[PDB]
Structures are given as structure tokens and as C-alpha cells.
Design an enzyme around this catalytic site. Structure first.
Site, short mmCIF file in Angstrom:
data_model
loop_
_atom_site.label_atom_id
_atom_site.label_comp_id
_atom_site.label_asym_id
_atom_site.label_seq_id
_atom_site.Cartn_x
_atom_site.Cartn_y
_atom_site.Cartn_z
N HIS A 79 42.52 39.96 40.82
CA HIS A 79 43.56 39.00 41.16
C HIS A 79 42.92 37.65 41.50
CE1 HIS A 79 47.05 41.42 40.98
NE2 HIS A 79 46.60 42.34 41.84
N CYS A 128 44.15 37.51 37.09
CA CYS A 128 45.58 37.73 37.10
C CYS A 128 46.02 36.72 38.17
CB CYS A 128 45.89 39.17 37.50
SG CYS A 128 47.62 39.64 37.30
#
Length: 368
Positions: A79, A128
Site C-alpha cells: 500500500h 496500491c
């Protein structure tokens, strides 16, 4: 011909988030990139699921290897967070919602890389994304398409890595290879006409990942750091343990990542006088946070191991140690044996401690 003084890489893949969606692609992507880079003579450290403290410490140790003329490669998959023109790498222990102080600032790493006299420094992010004078020869690749593909095996493979793995072994200037990867992604249906890859380069000369290693010759205070980084791929050797009753137990070792190791045991010899016996591993260091309910399994899959099943002997008991970066001392654990003599009803217990040193990531003298 351009030359590398040395070739060093650090690869981090974050998947198992406490407060955020779990990712699938970093597992196989870090595993496959590690193999590709080792083929190119990089000394690689690969780490799966790191906390904020662990991420900062691993990046600091990697930065320490970047002496004059050295080729460095840093890869992060997981992430990411963007806030006021700055991008951040999100560790597995990050609370929800995202806060800058809990994350690693990409711009600050780039700034520290710009002060090195590296022959080449490649920094690749595969994130992400979420919003709410003397050359260092830095090449920065930033993919925001982290979306994947399921294989015949049932394993997840990433979009940026799919194109990267097909080009990385070629003897071509790194920036030229990355431009081809950006074109491949632009033609790809999932990433067509979208902001999927940004490449920044301050590369004034034709350097490639395939460039040969020069007059390596370390130095005085870079010696130990480099020998430890070079040894973080070495598994403990197989051992055969003898018990007083005569039963012999084989202990084997396998690696998925620098911080993920599989331990397997099997009874190699049972004397005729022993009717029944079983062996199991116990009492691991507290810092590893194992849990007996996850150790001593009949198959590697039951421990959460799927990457090295071809290299794992059948008919053993398996244990997966996935938090080795937490280990501050020698890896000491116990092999317990239960056994019974033919004609006798009582089960006898015996046990011995095993010291396998500081395996893989534990070789590094980093802050923990």
C-alpha cells in the site's frame, strides 16, 4: 564498458495488513524479483510484511551499503499513500486512517540517495495508491497499478512485475528498459491511457543491471556490513540429531524470503527395540511469536508455505518462521522426542536444544 563496484538490493513486499485490505501480488513478485536479481550478481535481501520500525531499519542498512561506484536497487510493493506532493510507503502495522508519521516518506529516501556517489541507484515503487553536483545516477520507477492475475497454480502475479521480469535480464541501459515497460503497460488493457508508471532519471551514462562487477575491494568500515548482507541468503545446513535411545532425527531448512524460513523434521532411524516414536519442534525465541498451533504440520501448505514446495522433501513435519527480522539472538529451539520400547507401555520423553546461529536476515547487525 561501464562497471559496478558492487551490486546490492533490498526488496520489501507488504501483503498482510492489520487495518487495511490484504494484497496478493507482493508475495510472488518479491520472490521472482529476488531470483532475477541474484542471477545478475546482486547480493539481495528480501523481506515480507514489515512494520514501520522494521521498514525504517532495513532501508537505513541498505543506504549504508551505497559506497562510491556501487549499484543499488530498492524495491517496494504494497500500500502507498499520497499527501501534499509527497508519496509514502505504508507498513503492515499502520492504523486506519493513514497518517504520514506512521509511513516512510519516499521523497526523504530519494533525498538521502542523492547524497551518495553510486554508480547506479534504482528505486522502484509498486504501490496500491490512496489519497484523502556529483551524480548519484538515480533512476526512480513509480507504478500505481498494484489488480493482478491468477496463475494455473492459484498464485497471484502483478502487472508491473509481469512486464519487468520479461525485460530485466537484457543488456540494455536501465532507462531504455523502463521506457519499454511503460509502453508494454500502455498497450495492456488494464493500464491503457492511464497514469500507471512515472519514470524519473538523472542517468548521464549508459548503465545497466547486467554491468560487470569492478575492483570490488570493500574498505575498512564497510567490510562487516557487506559480508553480513552477502551472507543473508545462506541457509543453516541440514543436521542429524542422535538421541540416547538410538532414534535419529533429520532437521532441514528452506527459504522463501530473507525473513521467512521453513524448518522440517523427520525420523531417519528408529532402532528395532523402539516400537513407536514421534519428533516435534518447540520453545522458539519469544521475539519470533510462533504459536504451537501453527508449527509441526503434515504439509508445507498448512504452515502458509506455497513458494518452495518442489524443493521441500515429502513426509516431514513443517514449521514456518515468517518473522525472522524480529530475531536479536542465535536461533535456539528444542527438538522433543516421544518414544516407546517394544514390550513396555510407558511413553518416554527426551529433548535437546539446537542452535542454528543467526539465519538469513538475522546475520545483519541492524536496529531491532
Amino acid at each position: 564498458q561501464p562497471l559496478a563496484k558492487d551490486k546490492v538490493a533490498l526488496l520489501i513486499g507488504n501483503m498482510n495488513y492489520r487495518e487495511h485490505p490484504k494484497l496478493k501480488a507482493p508475495l510472488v513478485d518479491v520472490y521472482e524479483l529476488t531470483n532475477l536479481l541474484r542471477q545478475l550478481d546482486f547480493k539481495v535481501v528480501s523481506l515480507l510484511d514489515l512494520t514501520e520500525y522494521e521498514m525504517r531499519n532495513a532501508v537505513d542498512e541498505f543506504l549504508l551499503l551505497l559506497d562510491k561506484g556501487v549499484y543499488g536497487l530498492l524495491y517496494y510493493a504494497g500500500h502507498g499513500y499520497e499527501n501534499f506532493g509527497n508519496s509514502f510507503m505504508v507498513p503492515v502495522d499502520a492504523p486506519n486512517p493513514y497518517r504520514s508519521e506512521n509511513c516512510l516518506c519516499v521523497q526523504n529516501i530519494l533525498k538521502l540517495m542523492q547524497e551518495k556517489e553510486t554508480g547506479l541507484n534504482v528505486f522502484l515503487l509498486d504501490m496500491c495508491r490512496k489519497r484523502n553536483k556529483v551524480t548519484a545516477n538515480i533512476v526512480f520507477g513509480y507504478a500505481t497499478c498494484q489488480a493482478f492475475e491468477i496463475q494455473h497454480s492459484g498464485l497471484a502475479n502483478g502487472i508491473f512485475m509481469k512486464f519487468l521480469k520479461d525485460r530485466l535480464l537484457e543488456d540494455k541501459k536501465i532507462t531504455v528498459l523502463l521506457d519499454e515497460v511503460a509502453e508494454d503497460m500502455g498497450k495492456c488493457h488494464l493500464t491503457k491511457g492511464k497514469q500507471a508508471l512515472e519514470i524519473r532519471s538523472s542517468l548521464s551514462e549508459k548503465r545497466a543491471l547486467t554491468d560487470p562487477i569492478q575492483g570490488t575491494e570493500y574498505s575498512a568500515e564497510s567490510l562487516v556490513r557487506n559480508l553480513q548482507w552477502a551472507k543473508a541468503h545462506e541457509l543453516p545446513e541440514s543436521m542429524c540429531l542422535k538421541f540416547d535411545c538410538g532414534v535419529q532425527i533429520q532437521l532441514g531448512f528452506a527459504a522463501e524470503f530473507s525473513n521467512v524460513m521453513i524448518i522440517y523434521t523427520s525420523i531417519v532411524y528408529k532402532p528395532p527395540e523402539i516400537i513407536m516414536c514421534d519428533a516435534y519442534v518447540t520453545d522458539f525465541p519469544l521475539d519470533l511469536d510462533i504459536d504451537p498451533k501453527d508449527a509441526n504440520k503434515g504439509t508445507p501448505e498448512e504452515t502458509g508455505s506455497y513458494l518452495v514446495s518442489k524443493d521441500l522433501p515429502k513426509h516431514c513435519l513443517y514449521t514456518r518462521l515468517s518473522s525472522l527480522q524480529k530475531l536479536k539472538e542465535h536461533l535456539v529451539f528444542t527438538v522433543c522426542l516421544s518414544y516407546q520400547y517394544s514390550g513396555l507401555e510407558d511413553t518416554v520423553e527426551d529433548k535437546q536444544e539446537v542452535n542454528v546461529g543467526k539465519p538469513l536476515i538475522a546475520k545483519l547487525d541492524m536496529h531491532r
